[PDB]
Amino acid sequence: FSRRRIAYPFYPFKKLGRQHPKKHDTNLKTAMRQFLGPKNYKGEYVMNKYFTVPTNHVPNYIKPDLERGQSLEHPVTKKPLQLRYDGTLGPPPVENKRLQNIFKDRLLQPFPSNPHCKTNYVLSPQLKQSIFEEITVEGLSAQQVSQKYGLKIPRVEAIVKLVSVENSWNRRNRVSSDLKTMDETLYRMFPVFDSDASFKRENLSEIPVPQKTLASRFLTIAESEPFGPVDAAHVLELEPAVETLRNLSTNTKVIYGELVEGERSQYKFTNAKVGKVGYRYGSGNRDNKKDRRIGFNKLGQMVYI
Amino acid sequence: TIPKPSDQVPDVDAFLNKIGRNCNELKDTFENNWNNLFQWDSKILKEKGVNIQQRKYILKQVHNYRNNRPIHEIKLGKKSFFGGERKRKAFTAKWKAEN
Amino acid sequence: TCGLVRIRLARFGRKNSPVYNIVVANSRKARDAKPIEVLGTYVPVPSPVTKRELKRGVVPIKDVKLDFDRTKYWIGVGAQPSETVTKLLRKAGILNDAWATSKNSRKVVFERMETL
Amino acid sequence: RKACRVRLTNGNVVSAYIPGEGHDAQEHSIVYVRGGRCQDLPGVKYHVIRGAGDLSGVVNRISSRSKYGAKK
Amino acid sequence: GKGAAKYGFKSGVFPTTRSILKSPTTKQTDIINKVKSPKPKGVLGIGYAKGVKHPKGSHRLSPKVNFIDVDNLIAKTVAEPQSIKSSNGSAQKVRLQKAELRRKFLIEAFRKEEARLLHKHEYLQKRTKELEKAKELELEKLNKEKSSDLTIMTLDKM
Amino acid sequence: PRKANLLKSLARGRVRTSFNKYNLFNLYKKGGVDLKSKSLYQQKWTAKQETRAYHGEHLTEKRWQTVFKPKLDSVAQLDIKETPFLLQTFAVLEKRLDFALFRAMFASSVRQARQFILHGNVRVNGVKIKHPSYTLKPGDMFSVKPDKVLEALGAKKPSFQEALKIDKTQIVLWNKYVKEAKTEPKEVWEKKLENFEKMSDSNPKKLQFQEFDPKWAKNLKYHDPIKLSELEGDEPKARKLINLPWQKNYVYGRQDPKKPFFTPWKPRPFLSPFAILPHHLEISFKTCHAVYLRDPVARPGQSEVISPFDVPVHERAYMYYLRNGK
RNA sequence: UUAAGAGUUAAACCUAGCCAACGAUCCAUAAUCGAUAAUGAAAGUUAGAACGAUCACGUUGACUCUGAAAUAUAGUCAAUAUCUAUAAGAUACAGCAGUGAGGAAUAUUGGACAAUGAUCGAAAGAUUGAUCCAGUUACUUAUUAGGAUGAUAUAUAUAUAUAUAUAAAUUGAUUAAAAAUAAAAUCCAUAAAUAAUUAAAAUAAUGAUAUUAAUUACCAUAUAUUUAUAUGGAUAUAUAUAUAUUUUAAUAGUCCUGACUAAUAUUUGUGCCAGCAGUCGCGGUAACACAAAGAGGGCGAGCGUUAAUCA
RNA sequence: UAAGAA
Ligand SMILES: [Mg+2]
Ligand SMILES: [Mg+2]
Ligand SMILES: [Mg+2]
Ligand SMILES: [Mg+2]
Ligand SMILES: [Mg+2]
Ligand SMILES: [Mg+2]
Ligand SMILES: [Mg+2]
Ligand SMILES: [Mg+2]
Ligand SMILES: [Mg+2]
Ligand SMILES: [Mg+2]
Ligand SMILES: [Mg+2]
Ligand SMILES: [Mg+2]
Ligand SMILES: [Mg+2]
Ligand SMILES: [Mg+2]
Ligand SMILES: [Mg+2]
Ligand SMILES: [Mg+2]
Ligand SMILES: [Mg+2]
Ligand SMILES: [Mg+2]
Ligand SMILES: [Mg+2]
Ligand SMILES: [Mg+2]
Ligand SMILES: [Mg+2]
Ligand SMILES: [Mg+2]
Ligand SMILES: [Mg+2]
Ligand SMILES: [Mg+2]
């Protein structure tokens, strides 16, 4: 069974009563107004909890279920408010007990309906500079930096590149005041990555799950045989799962052509083998088909492969 | 570079008259300048109002003159007097009967 | 060109986007018919070079893939290259200046260099 | 129910239902016949296309105009 | 296009690669010994038996395989000018350069093909005798008595 | 692509990839997707409806069905909570440049990210890319023009008329405060200190205050009332005619009226509910650069595909798109 | 006879065989296939348009010459049908355009040989309806086809929950009944245009496409490695030089909402009529199904429908 | 990598 269901709020709100013939209003609009609170002469909603950004590295994600859909607060004292019968905003008659003891995992959960979405941890500029110095100056391998700071290796390399770009931009005075204010207000919104904590440091033993293993296979053997990861790897015809981590932690003859004055291009001839080189004859044409191959040029132009 | 006018081809008018292919009517679009004949490219000629075949022929003959090759008029091939091969038998049948 | 066996270019790709197979073909078969052998590929469009890289001084690259040992075999048994293929093979070092023509005949800024 | 016998260009003579509120089909009219039976008329296994040939589209049609040969 | 799965998912075809040497050569002792071996009889026999007479106009034996002598093939296909030289003219020089290049390429191709065939035979013999050892090592390593085999019930006497 | 139409309808209540205020309320009032009392088709349809409203709404149904992958990618940890495999139903959209920009928070929406790409403001490891469908591979660095990012993340720049009216109101309130302070400084000091006591130290003003005299009220100066009718159309005039302790020599929100955002840059309103740091990108906000580390994966207890819907909704949507809605 | 086997074709002699219910002979129908297309979990099934491979034919039939190879789009004879030149004549568009017909239905009487080939030539070059481009056509597939903000308009009066009043307020409705952040307005863009250049397809030279793509929003140069500040040619101004340095948007249909099957905000007309319908079925005064308004659900430069294929 | 419905 299914009907159209206007997405009314799941929490109580005061609905319209008798309306002046010319109001022309909807209950959804009133629900939004109550959620937002009064709008300033400046076009601002100071009374709404979520109007302003946090500043203490504790994200201010929505909690419509814990707080019963009461999103209003005093902007200066931050104390909860409620809409009284007379159309004013005052203290709640009773205090909420679900808004003080909030599980620390819930504070990093952007969406109330998805427990598996959590925000990442921002790295402090000091840690990023430390990693950049370690990788570039002291020449420490990315594996041991990853282990020391508990960061996945691609993230470490990305940090190195991003810090290099930042260094260039700072040497050129391209980081304007607006950019610095934006960066620092964004940085104070998210939790800060802590190298020392065990539960805040990234797991460093992850490997992709290939299709080959995903199928469950079972072996019946004598009751006392040992059967370890290496035997399992042999059975599935794969490298053992430890060499996968080990390998993830880490000729053709060519002839360049004679250029002469006035010639606008050079020829390089790469050696190939007959029966493997060429455009095949009677190959599948997909240009009129839904999976036609689209690629991008070295200049970023969309081309048809 | 711009080559030297020769005694065989003193003026641009002489060049046009020698290459032929009814480019004699194209003497006006040039200002009779050796530099104009030997510096104008295909796009300039297209702007000036030269048709495709004429400008391609002129560029070919200008190149020949640059590399010291004769610029005598090559004539575009024509059909036989008795029509083309596919219509030759019919034409000759009608021609011999009528004469 | 002459002879029954000829090394020439067979057109592939879309309209306004030519690519070519370097092929050994019977002289009578169609240009895009299945040949005796596909010796390689040829992309006539040079690889784009950035303007800063033009300041550096790189030359745009025209890409040619080729089976050199088999191409020399086909030249040996008498196959006749076309004009464009003749140009391609002369600049690859397979053919020497004896295959040049009067029109095609100059200071060398770079020298044909073989790498591994 | 409004129907008509129609002789097709392939020579077969069929019975075709005429959909829509009102029709202007008459003897010797040129029509176009598609598949689709009229369920409550036995023997009529084809439909005439409104808005094609000499059969005009339904007059003052608002909804489903394309099914009845009506312009916007 | 699921047939392409049978060919590495490659759509379209190439012309089949021509063989530079169209018959086995003389420097290939394996094929020579194989053809020159006794011919079997019985259920897998190849030819006519001792007392059986073949059809009147037919040949009892398959045609004689004619092995290639690459030295002779080069000698006849591309022989160098027996005259010392002429060395005049311009087109004559162009033709001389072209002819020597063509000849050089053709000897190179023929001899490299010879070498590749013989090298392939050597490699295949080594591969066979390396597999024949790896397989035996594996079968024997599945013969080392495992202690856990004491838990598999046995009735060897019966 | 689809023409944006009623993307923020409160009655429909679909959640979009956007920092919009109406989108924020739609997300807030939602609750969960109600799957009870529904046939399997109705469940799958509801799931598809909601999840496609969020993930890649601007893609046509047929294009999305073409780019949909039954393959779901996950990582096994070799050193327990259940891996939410089917939150990867829409992971393939995350390698698109327009989604990468939105996850990097370089655009207020995927739609705005598309426009930023199409107008030439985006680069992928050096080369300008003008095609939103462009797909990033691991390790690719992309960047956005900093003004575009600052405008996406910043507050709207007011027009002259609106800012001038706001500043008129500023003058009136400042003068009212000055009068109240001058007449009765006792009660004003009392209220000021009481409010300082009430407020939390989170405000910077409290920290600065931690860091009676009748002379105080003598420093407060009235501000002349402005009438905009005569002042209309002349920005250099109104700029010098406004002088307040907080905003000095500029009309409200237009400190430098040649940049594309609220010029004394402050974050856009309602930014914190959507401020989510992705796990598959590294973001440098000073340079407005980012690196695409990997395709999002699911691990025990977590999925890196950011979504406002629970595992059952994505399961039902995945069932829908496996069979083309059969 | 043939280069060559064979009742292959011709001649002679013999023997009485050969095929066939695991389907002969006969009849009908059909070009065949793929590393091609569709579909499906797959086995498979379908197509054989496109790309490629093979065969056959060039109005119909037989024969002959030449040739390595031809019953050749050749020649001879005949048939059919047209033209005149009225002859032991020519032509046969299944080459490219194009016309008429048939049909539900399938386009230019286009440009260039610039590229890749092919023919002739010693070469210079000539020819090429191959080919390459363009035209027509939503036939198919892509990409774009605008983002952010946005529920009022007037008045009066180093702080900040601004507060008072007067106007108005479209359709539906009297609250979980909405249309609707939708409009309008606001901010910021880009496309197009406008100018400057301008590669690449091709080089020894040649560019049909072509009012090319791409780039720059005055032009260069001179250093840094795209963002910069400088030196010099522009630039009207006011009075060489402080200044600025093109303009600039927004355009969706079509089907459906009783169940199968997504569509709850309800109303009006008709009254077993008119009609609807893929299946069950709906319509007899209270129609969620007919015809419509409001609202709503799909897909979207398409949507529906018919014909078909696969599942 | 095999779903059914009236
Ligand atoms: Mg329903
Ligand atoms: Mg002549
Ligand atoms: Mg020749
Ligand atoms: Mg209808
Ligand atoms: Mg015989
Ligand atoms: Mg006989
Ligand atoms: Mg039979
Ligand atoms: Mg037939
Ligand atoms: Mg068939
Ligand atoms: Mg075909
Ligand atoms: Mg065809
Ligand atoms: Mg024939
Ligand atoms: Mg005909
Ligand atoms: Mg015939
Ligand atoms: Mg024709
Ligand atoms: Mg007709
Ligand atoms: Mg040509
Ligand atoms: Mg022509
Ligand atoms: Mg009303
Ligand atoms: Mg009624
Ligand atoms: Mg119905
Ligand atoms: Mg109806
Ligand atoms: Mg309506
Ligand atoms: Mg489309």
Residue numbers in the entry:
A (entry chain 6): 27 to 276, 291 to 345
B (entry chain 2): 30 to 128
C (entry chain P): 2 to 106, 110 to 120
D (entry chain L): 78 to 149
E (entry chain V): 2 to 159
F (entry chain D): 2 to 80, 88 to 219, 372 to 486
Publication text:
Second, we purified particles by tagging Rsm22 and solved the structure of a Rsm22-bound intermediate, referred to as state 3. The exchange of Ccm1 for mS47 is coupled to the irreversible removal of precursor rRNA that is accompanied by conformational changes of the mito r-proteins uS5m and mS26m, and additional ordering of a flexible linker of mS45 in state 3 that is previously absent in state 2. Although Rsm22 also prevents head compaction in yeast, unlike its homologues in human and T. brucei systems, yeast Rsm22 has lost SAM-binding capacity but has retained the overall methyltransferase fold. A C-terminal helical peptide segment of uS10m initially prevents the binding of mS46, the final mito r-protein to bind to the head domain. Dissociation of Rsm22 subsequently drives reorientation of h33 and repositioning of this peptide to allow mS46 binding and complete maturation of the head domain.
Mitochondrial ribosomes (mitoribosomes) synthesize proteins encoded within the mitochondrial genome that are assembled into oxidative phosphorylation complexes. Biogenesis of the mitoribosome requires trans-acting assembly factors that chaperone rRNA folding and guide mito r-protein incorporation. Here we used cryo-electron microscopy to determine nine structures of native yeast and human mitoribosomal small subunit assembly intermediates, illuminating the mechanistic basis for how GTPases are used to control early steps of decoding centre formation, how initial rRNA folding and processing events are mediated, and how mitoribosomal proteins have active roles during assembly. Furthermore, this series of intermediates from two species with divergent mitoribosomal architecture uncovers both conserved principles and species-specific adaptations that govern the maturation of mitoribosomal small subunits in eukaryotes.
